[PDB]
């Protein structure tokens, strides 16, 4: 019924601009006040901007004042967010939303990534040691951009004792690790291979531990 579809997101270099569009359906768009709300990674939610049905009153967050511009095309059922002079502090999931007295409708969201980095294929490194009757191994998936990467063990057959960690951003590039704990009698007699995929760079790497 009521649908909100954001578009325009993606990777951006710092200081450059981006235009977010939100297409509305299943309601009289021209009769509603619309919102832009953002969520930074690991951070909470922040209201970005508000525009009335007629565009008469517009409100902004102090973090975005004089940099961002809300607009709407009621004839084309579109909400826009013109984001200028972009900072890494603007990296967030952006949502267009309609707030009723008793209901809320949010879009899917578009990730806006503010980074001076460009598409980089990750380097996959083995983690092997140099009692609990267990041994821990792993993979280090270093310096890739953009997100995501998919990590698996033995083509997805091995999920028990696996821990894939949230990625960490440093110097514009992502890094991530995955640990696999197996009974010690089982290694190296039973092979452990991590499978890494970075679709953005069309990377598919397999790495056998030891």
């Amino acid at each position: 019924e009521v649908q909100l579809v954001e578009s325009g997101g993606g990777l951006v270099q710092p200081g450059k601009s981006l235009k977010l569009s939100c297409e509305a359906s299943g309601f009289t768009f021209s009769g509603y006040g619309m919102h832009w709300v953002r969520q930074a990674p690991g951070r909470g939610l922040e209201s970005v901007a508000y525009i009335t049905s007629s565009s008469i009153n517009i409100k902004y967050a102090d973090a975005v004042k004089g940099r961002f511009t809300v607009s709407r095309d009621n004839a084309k059922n579109l909400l826009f967010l013109q984001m200028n002079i972009l900072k890494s502090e603007d990296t967030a999931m952006y949502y267009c939303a309609r707030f009723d007295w008793d209901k809320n409708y949010w879009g899917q969201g578009t990730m806006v990534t503010v980074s001076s980095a460009k598409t980089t294929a990750p380097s996959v490194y083995p983690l092997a040691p140099a009692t609990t009757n267990t041994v821990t191994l792993g993979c280090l998936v270093k310096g890739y951009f953009p997100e995501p990467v998919t990590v698996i063990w033995n083509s997805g057959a091995l999920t028990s004792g696996v821990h894939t960690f949230p990625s960490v951003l440093h110097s514009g590039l992502y890094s991530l690790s995955s640990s696999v704990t197996v009974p010690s009698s089982t290694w190296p007699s039973q092979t452990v291979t991590c499978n890494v995929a970075h679709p953005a760079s069309s990377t598919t790497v397999d790495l056998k531990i030891e």
Binding site: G44, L45, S47, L127, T136, G138, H163, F165
Partner: protein, 213 residues
């Protein structure tokens, strides 16, 4: 700017338990308070509006109550699908402000971490870089301190850490800590320690690596 306060920050609980989160506004919000639930990778979902009204299609186990600046949110019998974050938001004055959030977690027995230290791989050293990894796995509670010492000196430059979400199978937490150095800076030292402090032990768990061995 009305500042929204949320207590507690984290709430450990068991399935079937009655759970109550508290919300505090910096000034009177005339019952204009919303409660949302948020799960990883998804948009917030409205559960309660106008302090105590149940949104359409929201399960019966959810409720709210509030007197001016003080407000509360209740789950009468906790379901596994309720494990996530909860936010309270005022819509009395723009900008509409959200609280920090309350994460519900599954209550569990205490569990000592399993610490494993790893040198940079020879493949990485060939590229002129050196990353040391330390896995601190299957611990409970969530609160832990993980540090790198290099020749006895606490090292913070080039250290990154991340913690997994509460495990589905065992309800523990796991942490990966990474120390990134140049090959030149790695070769400048010998002793690399991953020092772990957890409430399950007064003494630190210490895993060391000697660059020479």
């Amino acid at each position: 700017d009305i500042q929204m306060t949320q207590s507690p920050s984290s709430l450990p609980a068991s399935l079937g338990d009655r759970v109550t989160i508290n919300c505090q506004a910096s000034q009177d919000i005339s019952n204009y308070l919303n409660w949302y639930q948020q799960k990883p990778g998804k948009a917030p979902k409205l559960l309660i509006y106008y302090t105590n009204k149940l949104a359409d299609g929201v399960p019966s186990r959810f409720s709210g109550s509030g007197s001016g600046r003080d407000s509360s949110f209740t789950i009468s019998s906790l379901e596994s699908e309720d494990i996530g974050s909860y936010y309270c938001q005022q819509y009395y004055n723009y900008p509409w402000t959200f609280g920090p959030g309350t994460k519900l977690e599954i209550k569990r027995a205490d569990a000592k971490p399993t610490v494993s230290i790893f040198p940079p791989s020879s493949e990485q050293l060939g590229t002129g870089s050196a990353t040391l990894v330390c896995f601190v796995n299957n611990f409970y509670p969530k609160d832990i301190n993980v540090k790198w010492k290099v020749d006895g000196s606490e090292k913070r430059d080039g250290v990154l850490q991340s913690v997994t979400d509460q495990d589905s199978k065992d309800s523990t937490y796991s942490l990966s800590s990474t120390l990134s150095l140049t090959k030149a800076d790695y070769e400048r030292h010998n002793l690399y320690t991953c020092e772990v402090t957890h409430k399950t032990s007064t003494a630190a768990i210490v895993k060391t690596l000697n660059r020479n061995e």
